[PDB]
Design a protein around this ligand. Structure first.
Ligand SMILES: Nc1cccc2c1C(=O)N([C@H]1CCC(=O)NC1=O)C2=O
Ligand SMILES: [Zn+2]
Ligand SMILES: [Zn+2]
Lengths: 33, 786, 340
C-alpha cells in the first residue's frame, strides 16, 4: 500500500486514505494513476 | 492637466566649440554650442564680439564646419541628439542676419541600439562625405554632392562592433577612415578606405596595428606629415604606415586626456586638456629628407598650465585659447612665450558664467522686499560654487569643492550647505585649499596608497558676506545625503538636520546611517541629538512638526520629545527605496529612481500611513515635486517632463494617470517652489545650467495658448526646419508620444519678436475676434511671471 | 501580440522561462494533445493558477517541448516529455472547448529593456573612455569609478547608481550562487540580465506567490533587485501548512551533481516535485525504510519525511553505502520562506 504522491507506506488502508487526504494538492488521480 | 513652461535662464554649459570662417571669408568666427543654443562670435584683437545667437529645436550634439569646393565661406553641419541633421549657411543681407538652411533631414536607423560610446561625427577633409557613427556595427555615410537636399545616407556594415574613436585621414587618393576598436585580444587601430561607387570599405593603406591597451583618442595629423596619433593615459603613439613613434612621458600619467585641438595648420602643435583641467602642448618635430619628403622625428609634451575643467578646446589666433567647460566657467586663456614665476604659461583674460550643473537650489528673500532671490549649488570639483540669482543678474561665491545640497535658516541668517572634497590617501592629504578647510571655525564629528576618498562637510555660510562661518567634518567613510532646516515639535529653536549613510566599498547597500541635529547659535554649531538607524537616510522632510525620514526602503516618522531626542512614531515598509520624498498638507509623495511613484496619506487619528495611490512605470527619474493636492510633476528619462494626476471603482482611485508629457531637453536635478518676480510657480534647475519655471494655467487660457502655438508653428521658421511638435515629442530612445498639457513658453514669448505683417497672419480668425493688440497684452502678461 | 494556445490540465506549477519541466503523461486526452502539438508548434502553455480552484489564471508562460519519448510498457501509452519556459503571457480569456480542452486566448508580454542610468547625463568628452578592458575587488572599484564618473552632475552618488546597474547587481547574485554550488563555473550562467534573472529565479526556494510576483515584473533590473532582496533578507524555510515550524536555513542549501540547488524531478506516478537538496534538516520524522527503487540520485536510498507538527509530507532523507553520507531533499511546494 503506497501513497501515489509522496511514497508513504502503510500496512492498512485508513492511514493511507488519511495521508492522501492530508496532501494539499488537486489530486488529479484520473490523470496520474 | 494644464501647465506652462518658461526658460528663465538660457542654458550656459558648453557642449562644444568650433573655429572657422563662417560669417565671412575675411574674418574669423568662433561657434559655441550650448544646449539647444548656438552662439556665433567674431574673433577680434580685443576678444570675442557676439554676432549671432540662435536657438535650435534640438540638442546640438555634433557640430562641424566644412568648405566644399565652390563655396566662399564655410558651411556648418549640425546633427542633433534626436538625429535631425542639417547643413546651414550664414547669410548677412545688409544689416539683417539670418541663418539659411542649405539642407536638412532625419538620419535615423529604425532598428538599432545607440552606441554606448556615443554619437560620433566626422567630415572628410576634402569634403567628399560625412561619416556618422550612431549604432554599433554600422557606419552611416552622407555624400556631400549638391543633389542631396534631404541628406540621404547609406549604411556600411562594420565588423568591429566596439569602436572607441574614429577620424578621417589627411592625405590620400580616396577618403580614408582610421579608428581604434576593442576586441577580446585588446585595442587595435585599423584603417579602411571608403568607396562611394561601391558604397563599402576596402583594405586600408596600412594594416592594423596593436596599440596601448587604453588607446582611446585618435588625431589625424594634416600634411605634410599624414598618418594618425593615438593617445591614452600611458603613451602617445604616432602611426604612419611603416613609421611608428611612441613616447611615454611621465607628466600625463596622473589624469586622462579628454579633449584635443590643432594649433597650427600644419599640425606642428596640438593642445590637449585633461579631466582635472590641465592643459598640455604636444609638439611634432620634423626632418627634411634630402630629395624626399618631410617626416616626423620625435614627439614632445609639456605642461602649459592649469585651466577650468576642459570640455572643448579651440585656438583663437594670436595665442588665445577658448576653454569651454560643462563643470565650471568657460574662459579665454592667453598663452605666453615665457612662464610666470609660478611656473605656468597660461593666464586668464575673460570668464564666461556657467551656472550648471545645478545640484540643488533654494529661493530666499535675503533683503525682504517680497521678491525673493535664488541660490544654487553650481559646478563640481574645484569649480564648485554658489550662484546668487536675482532680477538676470548673477553673483558668484567659489568654494573649490563640490556642493551637494542647500537650505536656508531665516532666524540664523545663514545657509547650510553639504559639500564634498576629494582627498588622496597618501592619513589623507588635501589637494588644494577649499571652503571647508578655510572656514573661520572647524569641528570634527565624533561617535590603499593612491586611493582617493571623499571627505564630507556641512558648511554654515553667512547670508550677507557669504564667508564660511563654520565647517563640520563628518565621520570617516560617511556620505551625507539629505539636508533639511526646520523646527520640530514645540521646541522653539531652529535646527540643521542631516541624514548620512555609512558606505564601505566592500558592502553594496549601506547598512548603518545617522540622523544628526545641529543648532547654530552664538557662532557655534553643536550637535543636539543623534539617531542611529539601520540604513541610508536618502531624503528628509519636515512633516507638520515631525521629521519624515527615508531609511532605505522605509518611511519613518520621528517626533521631537521634550528631552530633545528623535523618537519613532510610525513606519511604512513600502517595498521601493524612498529616494524622493515630498510633502503637502497630509499627502506624501514617495519615489525611487525607476519612476514608481507612490502617494501615501498620514491618517492622524490612527497614527499610521495608508497607501492612497501608486504608479509603477519602469523609467529613470531625476526629480519629483508636488504642484498641488492632485497634480505631481517629475522628470523621466531622455530629458522629459511628466505630470501625474490623482483622481468610481477603487482601481481608478488608486492609479496616477499621466495627464501631460514634455521633452524639456535637459536633465532636471531639483524642483523648488517660489517665483523670482497662473497659480503657483515651480522653478527647476538643470545639468546644463538652465533654470525653468512651471505654472498652472486655467483651461480657457490653455486652449487659447495651444491654438496660438499651433498657429505660430506655421509662421515662425526654425533653424534647420525642425517641426516644433517633433522637438517637443516625448522620447524614450525607442518611442515617442506627442506632448500634452504643456504650453512651450519660449515659442509663445517669441510672438513678440515677429513683426506686424506676420503678427496679422498669426492672429487671423483666432477665437469678439481677437486682434494683435489683445494677444500682445496677453503675451506681456505671460512674460511678467519670469 | 494576441494568440490562442492550448493548456494541459494536469500541470500545476508556475513555470519560469528557462526552467526545465519534466512530465509524465497517462490519460488519453493529454496523450492526444501532445501527439498533435509535437507535429505542430511546440507551444505548450502553463497557467499560473492564482486560485486553487483551477479556474482563475492571469499570467502564464508558453512552455516549449524539447524532448519527447514514449514507453508503451504497462500495456498503456505512457509518454514522457521535457519542456522549457520561453515567454510570459497575459490571460485574455479562457475559451474552453467544453471537452476539458482549456484553450486560452492570451497576449505575449514584452521585456521593458531600459538604457544605462548614466546615458542621459553622460559627459560627451569623456564618453570615449566608457569602453574599458574586461577582466577582482579593485577591478570592481575601478568599474564603479569609471562608468558612473558623471554622477557628479546629478544629485545622487555613484554607489546609489551602482545599486541599479545590471553588471554590479549580477555580480552579487553570482557570489551568492557560487556560495551554494561550490563548482559553478563562471561561464555556466548566461551573460545578459534577462536570461540571468530568469535563471536565478528558477533556483531560489520561492514558494508560489513570490514567483507570480517575479513572473509579472517586466523590467530585468527590477527582477534582479527583487531576487537579491529575497536572497538576502529571507534565510529560513518553514512548513507551508504550519507556517511557523522551521525546517532549515538557507546556509544549509547544498547542490548535488550538475544541477543547481533545486531541480525538478518526477515520481513514479507522474507527480512533479521541485526538490531542494540540503545537508541538514530538523523537525522531520522519518517513515519507511531506506529503499532505492526509483531513487532520483543514484546510489542513495530514501525514507519519507514529514514535519512532526502537521504530518504533511515535506521531503526525504537520502543515504548511501560507501559522500555526503546523509542529506535531505525537500519538495519546494511544502516549504514557505520566512524572514528571521
Ligand atoms: N516507489 C515510489 C512509490 C510511490 C511514490 C514514490 C515512490 C518514489 O520513489 N518517490 C520519490 C521518492 C524517492 C526519490 O528520490 N524518487 C521518487 O520518485 C515517490 O514519490
Ligand atoms: Zn503522500
Ligand atoms: Zn507542518
Amino acid at each position: 500500500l503506497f501513497c501515489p504522491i509522496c511514497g508513504f507506506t502503510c500496512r492498512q488502508k485508513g492511514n493511507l486514505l488519511r495521508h492522501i487526504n492530508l496532501h494539499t494538492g488537486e489530486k488529479l488521480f484520473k490523470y496520474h494513476l | 492637466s494644464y501647465n506652462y513652461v518658461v526658460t528663465a535662464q538660457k542654458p550656459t554649459a558648453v557642449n562644444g566649440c568650433v573655429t572657422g570662417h563662417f560669417t565671412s571669408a575675411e574674418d574669423l568666427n568662433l561657434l559655441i554650442a550650448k544646449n539647444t543654443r548656438l552662439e556665433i562670435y567674431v574673433v577680434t584683437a580685443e576678444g570675442l564680439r557676439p554676432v549671432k545667437e540662435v536657438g535650435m529645436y534640438g540638442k546640438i550634439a555634433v557640430m562641424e564646419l566644412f568648405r566644399p569646393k565652390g563655396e566662399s565661406k564655410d558651411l556648418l553641419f549640425i546633427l542633433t541628439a534626436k538625429y535631425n541633421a542639417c547643413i546651414l549657411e550664414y547669410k548677412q543681407s545688409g544689416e539683417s542676419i539670418d541663418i539659411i538652411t542649405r539642407a536638412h533631414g532625419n538620419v535615423q536607423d529604425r532598428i538599432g541600439r545607440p552606441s554606448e560610446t556615443g554619437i560620433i561625427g566626422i567630415i572628410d577633409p576634402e569634403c567628399r562625405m560625412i561619416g556618422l557613427r550612431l549604432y554599433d556595427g554600422l557606419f552611416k555615410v552622407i555624400p556631400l554632392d549638391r543633389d542631396n537636399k534631404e541628406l540621404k545616407a547609406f549604411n556600411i556594415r562594420l565588423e568591429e562592433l566596439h569602436v572607441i574613436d574614429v577620424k578621417f585621414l589627411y592625405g590620400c587618393q580616396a577618403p580614408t577612415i582610421c579608428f581604434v576598436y576593442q576586441d577580446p585580444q585588446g585595442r587595435h587601430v585599423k584603417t579602411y578606405e571608403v568607396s562611394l561607387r561601391e558604397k563599402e570599405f576596402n583594405k586600408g593603406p596600412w594594416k592594423q596595428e596593436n596599440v596601448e591597451a587604453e588607446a582611446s583618442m585618435v588625431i589625424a595629423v594634416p600634411e605634410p606629415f599624414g598618418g594618425a596619433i593615438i593617445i591614452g593615459q600611458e603613451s602617445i603613439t604616432y602611426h604612419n604606415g611603416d613609421k611608428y613613434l611612441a613616447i611615454a612621458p611621465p607628466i600625463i600619467k596622473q589624469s586622462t586626456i579628454v579633449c584635443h585641438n590643432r594649433v597650427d595648420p600644419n599640425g606642428s602643435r596640438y593642445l590637449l586638456g585633461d579631466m582635472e583641467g590641465r592643459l598640455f602642448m604636444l609638439l611634432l618635430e620634423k626632418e627634411e629628407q634630402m630629395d624626399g619628403t618631410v617626416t616626423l622625428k620625435d614627439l614632445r609634451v609639456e605642461l602649459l598650465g592649469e585651466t577650468s575643467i576642459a570640455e572643448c578646446l579651440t585656438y583663437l589666433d594670436n595665442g588665445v585659447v577658448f576653454v569651454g567647460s560643462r563643470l565650471g566657467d568657460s574662459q579665454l586663456v592667453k598663452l605666453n612665450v615665457d612662464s610666470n614665476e609660478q611656473g605656468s604659461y597660461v593666464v586668464a583674460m575673460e570668464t564666461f558664467t556657467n551656472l550648471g550643473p545645478i545640484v540643488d537650489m533654494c529661493v530666499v528673500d535675503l533683503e525682504r522686499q517680497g521678491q525673493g532671490q535664488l541660490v544654487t549649488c553650481s559646478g563640481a570639483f574645484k569649480e564648485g560654487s554658489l550662484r546668487i540669482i536675482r532680477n538676470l543678474h548673477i553673483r558668484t561665491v567659489p568654494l573649490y569643492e563640490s556642493p551637494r545640497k542647500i537650505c536656508y535658516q531665516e532666524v540664523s541668517q545663514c545657509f547650510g550647505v553639504l559639500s564634498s572634497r576629494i582627498e588622496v590617501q597618501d592619513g589623507t592629504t588635501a589637494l588644494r585649499p577649499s571652503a571647508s578647510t578655510q572656514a573661520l571655525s572647524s569641528s570634527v564629528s565624533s561617535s590603499s596608497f593612491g586611493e582617493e576618498v571623499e571627505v564630507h562637510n556641512l558648511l554654515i555660510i553667512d547670508q550677507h558676506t557669504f564667508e564660511v562661518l563654520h565647517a563640520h567634518q563628518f565621520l570617516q567613510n560617511e556620505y551625507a545625503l539629505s539636508l533639511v532646516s526646520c523646527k520640530l515639535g514645540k521646541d522653539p529653536n531652529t535646527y540643521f538636520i542631516v541624514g548620512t549613510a555609512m558606505v564601505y566599498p566592500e558592502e553594496a547597500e549601506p547598512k548603518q546611517g545617522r540622523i544628526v541635529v545641529f543648532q547654530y547659535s552664538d557662532g557655534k554649531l553643536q550637535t543636539v541629538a543623534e539617531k542611529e538607524v539601520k540604513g541610508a537616510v536618502y531624503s528628509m522632510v519636515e512633516f507638520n512638526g515631525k521629521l519624515l525620514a527615508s531609511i532605505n526602503s522605509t518611511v519613518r516618522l520621528y517626533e521631537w520629545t521634550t528631552e530633545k531626542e528623535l523618537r519613532t512614531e510610525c513606519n511604512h515598509y513600502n517595498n521601493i527605496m524612498a529616494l524622493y520624498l515630498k510633502t503637502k498638507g497630509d499627502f506624501i509623495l514617495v519615489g525611487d529612481l525607476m519612476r514608481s511613484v507612490l502617494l501615501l496619506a498620514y491618517k492622524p487619528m490612527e497614527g499610521n500611513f495608508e497607501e492612497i495611490a501608486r504608479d509603477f512605470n519602469p523609467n529613470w527619474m531625476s526629480a519629483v515635486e508636488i504642484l498641488d493636492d492632485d497634480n505631481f510633476l517629475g522628470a523621466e528619462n531622455a530629458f522629459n517632463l511628466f505630470v501625474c494626476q490623482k483622481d468610481t471603482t477603487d482601481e481608478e482611485r488608486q492609479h496616477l494617470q499621466e495627464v501631460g508629457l514634455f521633452h524639456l531637453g535637459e536633465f532636471v536635478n531639483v524642483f523648488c517652489h517660489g517665483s523670482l518676480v497662473t497659480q503657483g510657480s515651480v522653478l527647476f534647475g538643470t545639468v546644463n545650467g538652465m533654470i525653468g519655471l512651471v505654472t498652472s494655467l486655467s483651461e480657457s487660457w490653455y486652449n487659447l495658448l495651444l491654438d496660438m502655438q499651433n498657429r505660430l508653428n506655421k509662421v515662425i521658421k526654425s533653424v534647420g526646419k525642425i517641426e516644433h511638435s517633433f522637438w517637443r515629442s516625448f522620447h524614450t530612445e525607442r518611442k515617442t508620444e506627442p506632448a500634452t498639457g504643456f504650453i512651450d513658453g519660449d515659442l509663445i514669448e517669441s510672438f513678440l519678436d515677429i513683426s506686424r505683417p506676420k503678427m496679422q497672419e498669426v492672429v487671423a480668425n483666432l477665437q469678439r475676434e481677437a486682434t494683435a493688440d489683445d494677444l500682445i497684452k496677453v503675451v506681456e502678461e505671460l512674460t511678467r511671471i519670469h | 501580440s494576441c494568440q490562442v494556445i492550448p493548456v494541459l490540465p494536469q500541470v500545476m506549477m508556475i513555470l519560469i522561462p528557462g526552467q526545465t519541466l519534466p512530465l509524465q503523461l497517462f490519460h488519453p486526452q493529454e496523450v492526444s494533445m501532445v501527439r498533435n502539438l509535437i507535429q505542430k508548434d511546440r507551444t505548450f502553455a502553463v497557467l499560473a493558477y492564482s486560485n486553487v480552484q483551477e479556474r482563475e489564471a492571469q499570467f502564464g508562460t508558453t512552455a516549449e517541448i524539447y524532448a519527447y519519448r514514449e514507453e508503451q510498457d504497462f500495456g498503456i501509452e505512457i509518454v514522457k516529455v521535457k519542456a522549457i519556459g520561453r515567454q510570459r503571457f497575459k490571460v485574455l480569456e479562457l475559451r474552453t472547448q467544453s471537452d476539458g480542452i482549456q484553450q486560452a486566448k492570451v497576449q505575449i508580454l514584452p521585456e521593458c529593456v531600459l538604457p544605462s542610468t548614466m546615458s542621459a547625463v553622460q559627459l560627451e568628452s569623456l564618453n570615449k573612455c566608457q569602453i574599458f578592458p574586461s577582466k577582482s575587488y579593485k577591478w570592481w572599484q575601478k568599474y564603479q569609478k569609471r562608468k558612473f564618473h558623471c554622477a557628479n552632475l546629478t544629485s545622487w552618488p555613484r554607489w546609489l547608481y551602482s545599486l541599479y546597474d545590471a553588471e554590479t547587481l549580477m555580480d552579487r547574485i553570482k557570489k551568492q550562487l557560487r556560495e551554494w554550488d561550490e563548482n559553478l563555473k563562471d561561464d555556466s550562467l548566461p551573460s545578459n540580465p534577462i536570461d540571468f534573472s530568469y535563471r536565478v529565479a528558477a533556483c531560489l526556494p520561492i514558494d508560489d506567490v513570490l514567483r507570480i510576483q517575479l513572473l509579472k515584473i517586466g523590467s530585468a533590473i527590477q527582477r534582479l533587485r527583487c531576487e537579491l532582496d529575497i536572497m538576502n533578507k529571507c534565510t529560513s524555510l518553514c512548513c507551508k501548512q504550519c507556517q511557523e515550524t522551521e525546517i532549515t536555513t538557507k546556509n544549509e542549501i547544498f547542490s548535488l551533481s550538475l544541477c543547481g540547488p533545486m531541480a525538478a524531478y518526477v515520481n513514479p506516478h507522474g507527480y512533479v516535485h521541485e526538490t531542494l537538496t540540503v545537508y541538514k534538516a530538523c523537525n522531520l520524522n522519518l517513515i519507511g525504510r531506506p529503499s532505492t527503487e526509483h531513487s532520483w540520485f543514484p546510489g542513495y536510498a530514501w525514507t519519507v519525511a514529514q514535519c512532526k507538527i502537521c504530518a504533511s509530507h515535506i521531503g526525504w532523507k537520502f543515504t548511501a553505502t560507501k559522500s555526503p553520507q546523509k542529506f535531505w531533499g525537500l519538495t519546494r511546494s511544502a516549504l514557505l520562506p520566512t524572514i528571521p
